[PDB]
Enzyme design. Structure first.
Site, PDB file in Angstrom:
ATOM      1  N   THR F   1       1.269  -0.982   0.167  1.00 48.75           N
ATOM      2  CA  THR F   1      -0.012   0.339  -0.202  1.00 48.75           C
ATOM      3  C   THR F   1       0.421   1.394   0.027  1.00 48.75           C
ATOM      4  O   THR F   1       1.328   1.886   1.186  1.00 48.75           O
ATOM      5  CB  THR F   1      -0.499   0.115   1.469  1.00 48.75           C
ATOM      6  OG1 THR F   1      -1.888  -1.114   1.121  1.00 48.75           O
ATOM      7  CG2 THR F   1      -1.861   1.266   1.166  1.00 48.75           C
ATOM      8  N   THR F   2       0.989   2.140  -0.634  1.00 48.92           N
ATOM      9  CA  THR F   2       1.987   3.025  -1.408  1.00 48.92           C
ATOM     10  C   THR F   2       0.685   3.564  -2.178  1.00 48.92           C
ATOM     11  O   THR F   2       1.121   3.600  -3.772  1.00 48.92           O
ATOM     12  CB  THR F   2       3.679   3.077  -1.776  1.00 48.92           C
ATOM     13  OG1 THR F   2       3.807   1.346  -0.418  1.00 48.92           O
ATOM     14  CG2 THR F   2       3.805   3.970  -1.912  1.00 48.92           C
ATOM     15  N   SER F 168       4.017  -5.585   2.138  1.00 54.95           N
ATOM     16  CA  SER F 168       2.067  -5.350   1.287  1.00 54.95           C
ATOM     17  C   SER F 168       2.370  -4.564  -0.372  1.00 54.95           C
ATOM     18  O   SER F 168       1.433  -3.866  -0.369  1.00 54.95           O
ATOM     19  CB  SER F 168       1.656  -4.244   2.747  1.00 54.95           C
ATOM     20  OG  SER F 168       1.971  -3.511   2.670  1.00 54.95           O
ATOM     21  N   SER F 169       3.545  -3.702  -0.512  1.00 56.23           N
ATOM     22  CA  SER F 169       3.227  -3.275  -1.810  1.00 56.23           C
ATOM     23  C   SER F 169       3.932  -3.740  -2.862  1.00 56.23           C
ATOM     24  O   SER F 169       4.926  -4.283  -2.430  1.00 56.23           O
ATOM     25  CB  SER F 169       4.193  -1.635  -1.571  1.00 56.23           C
ATOM     26  OG  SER F 169       3.198  -0.828  -0.478  1.00 56.23           O
TER      27      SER F 169
END
Lengths: 232, 236, 246, 240, 226, 199, 235, 219, 204
Positions: F1-2, F168-169
């Site tokens: 998440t980025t 998570s990215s």
């Protein structure tokens, strides 16, 4: 919804809607009731049916509780709503207070409804006048009359419906300490109170009685004729 | 009694709805629209009573969405009310179904809103007729007209206003000849209609002309400078 | 809003009655003639069909005769639209009764339950009253076979025999004369309906298609209701066909 | 005929009489005028003196809707004061949502929605006042719109409302108001009102002016006492 | 907020009495139930040649096996389409089955009953013909503004229905083929409708074992051979 | 998440990552987190993917209804306020975080952090669990007055650096650039990702 | 005729007759007068008794320390606005811990008065309100109307026979600003003289007053302190 | 429970298995999964049993309302905005998981819906408990715009890899083939279990039960 | 859990043209036993039945709402409900209350109201309808009842075989369960009539 005033005033101050309501009260059948010594007795005339109707639904003498019963004269429509919601108050009073119901307590809540129906928006005043009668604590009987306007009175002997004023004339004249002396003289007075407005009616008179701790008892047609057999 | 509120007349009519039909007619403005092959054009009367009034401040062409234009004829009080209510619908359509509202459902929802005015006696019909245009990928150009009664139907050539009777007659004369449908030559037919009825030869600022095309599904308003070009130079 | 057009049903006449209710009883008299009979072996119900045409079908069980529940049924004379409203409300009250006590509702309880709803609109709400008059038949655990008649004002009562709709004065008069109280049963008293329906109908040659008959009888501890066979009703009329000659 | 008894009932000629009476109610109001030019929008109001007992500044007909939006009203005064709070609460809900001042085209449109909403039903009545909404912004410039009892927006280079209307509108047409500047507009606005009103029924009056534009730094502001009297002295030249 | 329908001194309903008077003043409509299908024929009359015929249709489907026609005020019928279609879907949620004809028209007429009772709403000025096919039984019903639905082997309504019923007293027989019943309904509207008879003016649709299917003007042109 | 946003003269640049991750097992590795608020206005989703998508359409609706009334695209500040007013209202039951950026015909390119429901104006904004490690790279590399291509350099490199460290990215980059001309789109594939020191 | 039934119906001259008759009911009752100087403001209320056995009605309603009001119109209609006005003034000190400004209060009261007007079924308030108050800018005299209109006045006389009273107020208005608290009451009571006929003029029993000032909170006087206020003045 | 889907040139195909389990035991061998919405649009659910069932049927009714009201056939992108707004209103508390795809006039579109209400467009996906096992083969062996019959056998290998992999995937395997021309449903497409027989034959004659009471109800 | 509070079990099978249903009579609280006279199976009318298990309260509750909505459907339409249609009613009834779910495991078996055609099915605690043409088992002894059924179940068996089949099924199965047993009621559904028998089982 429907929100507007129904009953409004007049240039002379009297109420158009309420006076027409009490007019429909007098248009109904003649009902009578008295407060006896140790008992209470109710009665109402029966329009003579010809070999048809069943007397279960026609009976106009009901009972709100074991302590208190009632009768009504007027439009049969609005009578059944009052009987139902008054019996709800009788059970609600016993639900709220362990002590039994009071005739004066139940009576005021009844006539108070008709007062609400008069001043409420969109509602209508009833065309019924009910006689609330029962036993208080220690066995002291009480007889109360309602009004479509919402007031309630106390009566020792009372007559409602058609010719209520005519029977009231017979009441005030023939009501003395000799009246409602005993259970027999109390019932015979109710019969004679129905003999003025009766035209060739005969057996049409039905009676009811509540005796002390016992609940309202309906006199059988033959038991009624037993007291009716004595006239002259 | 029946001539005041909305209730069924002894002949089956509705006078409150019919007096509205005279209220659209009372506005003093005549509007015409023609559905062409590749386009749909709207031409209405643009009136400027006083020179102190401004042009862009008063306009009869409104945009319900990007791809749907709207023209209004009647008392302007009821004009702006429906357009805001229509934009509360066309936008709501995309929040639910996720695409541009078709002209079919837009006329159906606006009618249902007007149908309640006739059915419910608390409210009143609105004094403006609505002509909605647009384009779909199947039926192509779409032209509908919604009366305050709630009725709408596909009209090849429609008209409204005081001259609607005379306007409909000339629109029939052009279609009776099987007039070849092209974009700008159809724009003439809608303009020449109002031109021959009133016998005036209007100025460019006296009319308001909207357009929609297959190439441009987004509704557009014809420039008054381009109006002058196709009035004077082409009267033919 | 526009109090000018407000009729105000709740207003009493100078005679002390209701405007809409008085006109409601007249609208019922224009409807078809319907009668009912309470006998020893069960309840009897017969109804004329005022609609007569060669294109009529009536795919349903019956026109003016409906089934309230397992143990009860009903007839109707009055406005045909408001009848379906009362029929649904009777089916709602009867089934909501089955929830609490898990028992069939008695005849008197279901009747007085709707009559409170009927007159509730005459008491308040401003909505027009109902112009529907309903007959009630069925069986209950206590009182047994019962026959009830209702009025648009909300008033009602028990009846051994009665008639509703057109020809009310003539039929009820003809009913009492030959009516046998607690004596003449389904088989025999069924011939009276055909005899009365022929007199109430001004057009002679009473047809089995122009009338409809349904009975309800509890047998072997089970309530049985059916619509009588038109082919048999014809023979039941063939009885009345030979009655004037012999 | 009874066709005028309600606004929900249409005339057999297709007219609404109750809304038309509301326009006739504006004809009873005193004359108010306004003019827009390049620098800004200039307001003026004729303030009638009913009695000497009134304090200076009383019966104020100049209403402040928002920072960039002023308003001048002609009609029933309380109906304007009630709608003024509605417009103030509306512009406040706008900044509370979208975070900036509502433009004049957006505000005059939403107010017209409230005005016309009361013309639709039978349970309410239309506003008995017709008012003007001015605004100024560096993004737009001088803008002036007008709302009527029917709730319709009308933009005007110059306009007049109140009892005497057509006479004042013609005088505005006789001179171009766009080239002139707000400093010179208050001179003509004062001269017009002196020509509009004569002494027949009413006795005396005063000039109530309002400024919005570049001179006010984009904020609704009343006219100062020094410049107002200076413009009136130049207007007294026509009186003498 | 108050119902304007009151009882006349003769007992009739005045508002509903004029409701049917508006229905009789509309376009004629007829229907016939014969053999395995039911036909509904209506006449669509525009005000000029400038109005598109295929844009708006009077015959509309409700569900696969059910369709409806009308004669009366146009806009009042559009309200019933949304309420009838939405009612059939609420049916399909509970019982997961197609809706029968008898169940549909019942609660659909209940909407008519509500607005002839609830205050502030006028009664409907429309009368609908109900066409449905369920469990091999053809269903032809007729509804009125008051909400009373009947059963008819054949019926006529709208304008000149008296002469339309007279034709059904003769031209309508039993064991009649659905195709012949369509041409029979055309002979019924032959006297009523005047002027130029085309396939676009008349609008016909049927329902059978295959379900309710609306007919195209091209197919109607073949059915106009009579 | 980025997610990432950078302001420059003519407009702004908005980057995103395609990895939608819940837990240690990737749910959907290819997705476009850019959700249009309007033709000229976009937003950047972050946090919970599902809860963020609902706010985007609820914002894109309220903005569209206001847009056609004035026939002009709303201000970028108005877009951030609608996002904030919706977020802050439901922020207790919604963990979603958004990033608002756009261009208008008056103010120009703007970026307003809506994170957690607050409002801030920044020349560059970062968000998500992957942006936690790029605070060092954004300070030394960023300099004002960069062209859109030079911005995409700083934009792509910072995201290409992000997705390496964060678990998570990942996935591919989705770029959006809004200027007076229109909207541009660039998709940087995994092999097209600029590669940094892996040792 | 048919246009007088409700408020919503407009006359063909553009006038609401119900609002017109609402102003007529105000002229049907006791006449009150009030005025303000640069410092002190006084509200002179005329108390009237139905008979001599019955006492005089209360025309003054205490609002707050800085605010007071007199009522002229239908009696009980002011009770609804009274309890509302008192609740609004308490809510101001309950939140802001500050007395609500006089001009801001009347603007809020004029709002609640106007709301029921345009809405059918709600009766407009048929009582007039003369309210006074003091703030950092000095005293204020605000007269209202059943139409919800409210003005700002140096002195105002409302009610029956207020004509000759207003004429007295206009000529002496120049003095009302420069007079002190004692002279404000004097000329304020002599202004009440014109509101009544030549037989019954004024007494300390049927006339009550109230005052608000710079350092003096709003107070109410009836008989005791009013006797020296009246006496010593020529009429 | 494992369901899968894919996009080919002319349309989409949604695969599923037949086995439903009560999370300890096999509840049903043949239990169907794929649901029905529109003639051109069919869907298949996963996750919580009843939450997937009711959700599809409530959306299927709104599609028929929109169809007949517009006179136009349904749209695929319209389906998701009905679903998620119903599921997001419950804030993911409903465990319904949906893979929704179909064909409209625009073209093949295959969406997916997670319990929290997320949605994404993509050529192929798989959900359920054994999803990660079946997603493997799908992610690895997919090619852009594969042949119809080539994608059919690819889906047969897909769920088959998820059967042995997870304890929730078993029974038979069926798929729904939706094309631009029309829709089609294939039942009994894959039967991995051949051992349905019984070894010993047991016939129990009457009387082996200790009868107590007997009663009969005629009809 | 609460599903094991009152215990109990319901079993149903299908023959060729006929179907069979059997269930235990035990009613108790956890380890304590109360009474063996409870009835877990209620008549739905001609050629249709419904079983219920789990919490005994919802068995006496949900089943009472059945005939409520059932009669309303039987009064409006002149036909009896289909067993395939009734399954949608219970699944919809459980999903109105889904949020705080009733506790039960419905079992439905019967014939096509139209003629002879048999149909069977069962539902889930959360209201998911499940159509199985072989057999349905529900209760706390479920895992024990499977092996007995699946071994002795056959697609087509006359009512004579269904007698011993589901009997011997219940007997050995219910044995190993502590909270189920002590009497069994058996219902056999034929075309023209219905057979109902009582089984002699160990009291334990």
């Amino acid at each position: 919804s429907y929100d507007r005033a129904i009953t409004v005033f007049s240039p002379d101050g009297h109420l158009f809607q309420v006076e027409y309501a009490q007019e429909a009260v007098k248009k109904g059948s003649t009902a009578v009731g008295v407060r006896g010594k140790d008992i209470v007795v109710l009665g109402v005339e029966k329009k003579s049916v010809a070999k048809l109707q069943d007397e279960r639904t026609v009976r106009k003498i009901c009972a709100l509780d074991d302590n208190v019963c009632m009768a009504f004269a007027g439009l049969t429509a609005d009578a059944r709503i009052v009987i139902n919601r008054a019996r709800v108050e009788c059970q609600s009073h016993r639900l709220t207070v362990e002590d039994p119901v009071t005739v004066e307590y139940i009576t005021r809540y009844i006539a108070s409804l008709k007062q609400r129906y008069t001043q409420s928006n969109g509602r209508r005043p009833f065309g019924i006048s009910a006689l609330i009668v029962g036993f208080d604590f220690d066995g002291t009987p009480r007889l109360y009359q309602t009004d479509p306007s919402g007031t309630y009175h106390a009566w020792k002997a009372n007559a409602i419906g058609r010719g209520a004023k005519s029977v009231r004339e017979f009441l005030e004249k023939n009501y003395t300490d000799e009246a409602i002396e005993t259970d027999d003289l109390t019932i015979k007075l109710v019969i004679k109170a129905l003999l003025e407005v009766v035209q060739s009616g005969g057996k049409n008179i039905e009676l009811a009685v509540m005796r002390r701790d016992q609940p309202l008892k309906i006199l059988n047609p033959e038991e009624i004729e037993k007291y009716v057999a004595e006239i002259e | 009694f029946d001539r005041h509120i909305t209730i069924f007349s002894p002949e089956g009519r509705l006078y409150q709805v019919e007096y509205a039909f005279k209220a659209i007619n009372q506005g003093g403005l005549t509007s015409v629209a023609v559905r062409g092959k590749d386009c749909a054009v709207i031409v209405t009367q643009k009136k400027v009573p006083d020179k102190l009034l401004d042009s862009s401040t008063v306009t009869h062409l409104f945009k319900i969405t990007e791809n749907i234009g709207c023209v209004m004829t009647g008392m302007t009080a009821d004009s702006r009310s429906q357009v805001q209510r229509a934009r509360y619908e066309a936008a709501n359509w995309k929040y639910k179904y996720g695409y541009e509202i078709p002209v079919d459902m837009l006329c159906k929802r606006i009618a249902d809103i007007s149908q309640v005015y006739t059915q419910n006696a608390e409210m009143r019909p609105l004094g403006c007729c609505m002509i909605l245009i647009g384009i779909d990928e199947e039926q192509g150009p779409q032209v509908y007209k919604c009366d305050p009664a709630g009725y709408y139907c596909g009209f090849k050539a429609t008209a409204a206003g005081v001259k609607q009777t005379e306007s409909t007659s000339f629109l029939e004369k052009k279609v009776k000849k099987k007039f070849d449908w092209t974009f700008e030559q159809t724009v003439e037919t809608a303009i020449t209609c109002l031109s021959t009825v009133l016998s005036i030869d209007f100025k460019p600022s006296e009319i308001e002309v909207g357009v929609v095309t297959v190439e441009n599904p987004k509704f557009r308003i014809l420039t008054e400078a381009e109006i002058d070009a196709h009035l004077v130079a082409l009267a033919e | 809003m526009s109090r000018r057009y407000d009729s105000r049903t709740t207003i009493f006449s100078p005679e002390g009655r209701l405007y809409q209710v008085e006109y409601a009883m007249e609208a019922i008299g224009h409807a078809g003639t319907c009668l009912g009979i309470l006998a020893n072996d069960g309840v009897l119900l017969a109804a004329e069909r005022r609609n007569i045409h060669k294109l009529l079908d009536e795919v349903f069980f019956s026109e003016k005769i409906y089934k309230l529940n397992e143990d009860m049924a009903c007839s109707v004379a009055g406005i045909t639209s408001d009848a379906n409203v009362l029929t649904n409300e009777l089916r709602l009250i009867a089934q909501r009764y089955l929830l609490q006590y898990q028992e069939p509702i008695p005849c008197e309880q279901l009747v007085t339950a709707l009559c409170d709803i009927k007159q509730a609109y005459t008491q308040f709400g401003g909505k027009r009253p109902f112009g529907v008059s309903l007959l009630y038949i069925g069986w209950d655990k206590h009182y047994g076979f019962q026959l009830y008649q209702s009025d648009p004002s909300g008033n009602y009562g028990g009846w051994k025999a009665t008639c509703i709709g057109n020809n009310s004065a003539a039929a009820v008069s003809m009913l009492k004369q030959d009516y046998k109280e607690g004596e003449m049963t389904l088989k025999s008293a069924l011939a009276l309906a055909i005899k009365v329906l022929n007199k109430t109908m001004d057009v002679s040659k009473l047809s089995a298609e122009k009338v409809e008959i349904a009975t309800l009888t509890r047998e072997n501890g089970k309530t049985v209701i059916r619509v009588l066979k038109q082919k048999e009703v014809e023979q039941l009329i063939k009885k009345h066909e030979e009655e004037e000659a012999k | 005929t009874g066709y005028d008894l309600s606004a929900s009932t249409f005339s057999p000629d297709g007219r609404v009489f109750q809304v038309e009476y509301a326009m006739k109610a504006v004809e009873n109001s005193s004359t108010a005028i306004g003019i827009r030019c390049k620098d800004g929008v200039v307001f003026g109001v004729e303030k009638l003196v009913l009695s000497k007992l009134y304090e200076e500044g009383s019966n104020k007909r100049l209403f402040n809707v928002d920072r960039h939006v002023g308003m001048a009203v002609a009609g029933l005064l309380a109906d304007a004061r009630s709608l003024a709070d509605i417009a103030r609460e509306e512009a406040s809900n706008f900044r509370s949502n979208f975070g900036y001042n509502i433009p004049l085209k957006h505000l005059a449109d939403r107010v017209a929605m409230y005005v016309h909403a009361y013309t639709l039903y039978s349970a309410v009545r239309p506003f008995g006042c017709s008012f003007m909404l001015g605004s100024y912004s560096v993004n737009d410039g001088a803008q002036l719109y007008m709302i009527d009892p029917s709730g319709v927006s009308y933009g005007y280079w110059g306009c007049a409302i109140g009892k005497a209307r057509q006479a004042a509108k013609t005088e505005i047409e006789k001179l171009q108001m766009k080239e002139m500047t707000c400093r010179d507009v208050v001179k003509e606005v004062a001269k017009i009102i002196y020509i509009v009103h004569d002494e027949v029924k009413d006795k005396a009056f005063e000039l109530e002016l309002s400024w919005v534009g570049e001179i006010t730094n984009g904020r609704h502001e009343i006219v100062p006492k020094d410049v107002r009297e200076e413009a009136e002295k130049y207007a007294k030249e026509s009186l003498k | 907020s108050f119902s304007l329908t009151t009882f006349s001194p003769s007992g009739k309903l005045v508002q509903i009495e004029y409701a049917l008077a508006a229905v009789a003043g509309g376009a004629p409509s007829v229907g016939i139930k014969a053999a395995n299908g039911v036909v509904l024929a209506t006449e669509k009359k525009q005000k000029s040649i400038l109005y598109d015929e295929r844009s708006v249709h009077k015959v509309e489907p409700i569900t696969k096996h059910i369709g409806l026609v009308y004669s009366g005020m146009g806009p009042d019928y559009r309200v019933l389409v949304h309420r009838a279609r939405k009612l059939a879907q609420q049916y399909y949620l509970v019982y997961q089955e197609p809706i029968p004809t008898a169940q549909l028209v019942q609660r659909v007429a209940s909407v008519m009953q509500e607005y002839t009772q609830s205050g502030g709403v006028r009664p409907f000025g429309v009368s609908l013909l109900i066409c449905g096919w369920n469990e091999g039984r053809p269903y032809l019903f007729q509804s009125d503004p008051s909400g009373a639905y009947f059963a008819w082997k054949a019926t006529a309504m709208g304008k000149n229905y008296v002469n339309g019923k007279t034709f059904l007293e003769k031209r309508y027989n039993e064991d009649l083929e659905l195709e012949d019943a369509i041409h029979t309904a055309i002979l019924t509207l032959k006297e009523s409708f005047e002027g130029q008879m085309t396939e676009d003016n008349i609008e016909v649709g049927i329902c059978n074992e295959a379900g309710f299917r609306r007919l195209t003007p091209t197919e109607v042109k073949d059915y106009l051979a009579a | 998440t980025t997610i990432m946003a950078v302001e420059f003269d003519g407009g702004v640049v908005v980057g995103s990552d395609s990895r939608v991750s819940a837990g240690e097992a990737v749910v959907n590795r290819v997705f476009d987190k850019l959700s249009p608020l309007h033709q000229h206005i976009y937003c950047a989703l972050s946090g919970s993917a599902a809860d963020a998508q609902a706010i985007a359409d609820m914002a894109a609706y309220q903005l569209e209804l206001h847009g056609m009334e004035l026939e002009e695209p709303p201000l970028v500040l108005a877009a951030a306020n609608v996002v904030r007013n919706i977020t802050y209202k439901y922020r207790e039951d919604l963990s979603a975080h958004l990033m608002v950026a756009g261009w208008d015909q008056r103010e120009g390119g703007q970026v307003y952090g809506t994170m957690s429901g607050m409002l801030i104006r920044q020349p560059f904004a970062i968000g998500g669990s992957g942006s936690t490690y790029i605070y060092g790279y954004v300070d030394a590399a960023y300099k004002p007055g960069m062209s859109p291509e030079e911005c995409r350099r700083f934009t792509t490199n910072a995201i290409a650096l992000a997705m390496k460290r964060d678990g998570s990215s990942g996935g591919v980059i989705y770029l959006a650039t809004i200027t007076g001309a229109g909207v541009d789109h660039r998709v940087i594939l995994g092999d097209e990702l600029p590669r940094f020191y892996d040792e | 005729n048919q246009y007088d039934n409700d408020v919503t119906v407009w006359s063909p001259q553009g006038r609401i007759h119900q609002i017109e008759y609402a102003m007529e009911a105000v002229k049907q009752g006791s006449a009150t007068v009030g005025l303000k100087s640069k410092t002190h403001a006084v509200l002179v209320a005329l108390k009237r008794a139905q008979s001599e056995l019955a006492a005089h009605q209360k025309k003054i309603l205490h609002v707050d320390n800085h605010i007071g009001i007199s009522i002229a119109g239908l009696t009980a209609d002011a009770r609804l606005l009274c309890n509302f006005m008192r609740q609004e003034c308490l809510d101001s000190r309950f939140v802001f811990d500050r007395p609500l400004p006089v001009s801001r209060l009347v603007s809020l009261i004029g709002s609640k008065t106007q709301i029921p007007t345009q809405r059918y079924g709600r009766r407009p308030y048929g009582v007039g309100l003369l309210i006074a108050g003091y703030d950092d800018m000095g005293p204020h005299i605000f007269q209202t109307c059943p139409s919800a209109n409210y003005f700002d006045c140096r002195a105002m006389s409302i009610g029956a026979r207020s004509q000759s009273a207003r004429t007295y107020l206009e000529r002496h208005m120049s003095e009302f600003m420069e007079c002190n608290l004692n002279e404000l009451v004097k000329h304020g009571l002599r202004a009440l003289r014109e509101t009544l006929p030549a037989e019954q003029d004024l007494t300390t029993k049927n006339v009550s007053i109230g005052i608000v000032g710079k350092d003096l909170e709003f107070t109410i006087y009836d008989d005791d302190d009013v006797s020296p206020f009246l006496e010593g003045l020529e009429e | 429970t494992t369901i899968a889907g894919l996009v080919f040139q002319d349309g989409v195909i949604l695969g599923a298995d037949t086995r439903a389990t009560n999370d300890s035991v096999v509840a049903d061998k043949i239990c169907e999964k794929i649901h029905f919405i529109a003639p051109k649009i069919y869907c298949c659910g996963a996750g919580v049993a009843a939450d997937a069932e009711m959700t599809t049927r409530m959306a299927a009714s709104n599609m028929e309302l929109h169809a007949l009201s517009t006179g136009r056939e349904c749209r695929v992108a319209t389906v998701t905005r009905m679903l998620r707004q119903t599921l997001f209103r419950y804030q993911g508390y409903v465990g319904a998981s949906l893979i929704v795809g179909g064909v409209d006039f625009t073209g093949p579109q295959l969406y997916s819906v997670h319990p929290h209400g997320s949605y994404s467009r993509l050529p192929f996906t798989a959900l359920g408990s054994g999803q990660d096992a079946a997603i493997a083969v799908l992610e690895d062996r997919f090619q852009p715009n594969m042949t119809l019959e080539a994608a059919q056998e690819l889906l047969v290998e897909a769920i088959t890899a998820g059967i042995l992999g997870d304890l929730g995937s078993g029974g038979n395997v069926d798929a729904c083939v939706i094309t631009a021309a029309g829709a089609k449903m294939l039942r009994a497409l894959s039967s991995p279990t051949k051992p349905i027989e019984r070894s010993s034959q047991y016939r129990f004659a009457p009387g082996t039960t200790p009868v107590l009471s007997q009663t009969v109800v005629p009809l | 859990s609460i599903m094991s509070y009152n215990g109990g079990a319901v079993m149903a099978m299908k023959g060729k043209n006929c179907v069979a249903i059997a269930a235990d009579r035990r009613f108790g609280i956890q380890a304590q036993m109360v009474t063996t006279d409870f009835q877990k199976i209620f008549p739905m009318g001609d050629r249709l039945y419904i079983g219920l298990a789990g919490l005994a309260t919802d068995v006496q509750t949900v089943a009472q709402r059945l005939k409520f909505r059932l009669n309303l459907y039987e009064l409006k339409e002149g036909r009896q409900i289909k067993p395939y249609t009734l399954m949608s009613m219970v699944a919809n009834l459980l999903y109105e209350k889904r949020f705080g779910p009733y506790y039960t495991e419905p079992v439905i078996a019967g014939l096509d109201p139209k003629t002879f055609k048999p149909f069977i099915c069962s539902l889930d605690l959360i209201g998911c309808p499940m159509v199985t043409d072989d057999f349905v088992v529900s209760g706390t002894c479920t895992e024990q009842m499977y092996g007995m059924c699946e071994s002795l179940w056959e697609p087509n068996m006359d009512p004579e075989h269904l007698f011993e089949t589901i009997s011997q099924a219940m007997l050995n199965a219910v044995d190993r369960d502590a909270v189920s047993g002590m009497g069994v009621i058996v219902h056999i559904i034929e075309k023209d009539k219905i057979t109902t028998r009582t089984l002699k089982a160990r009291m334990d």
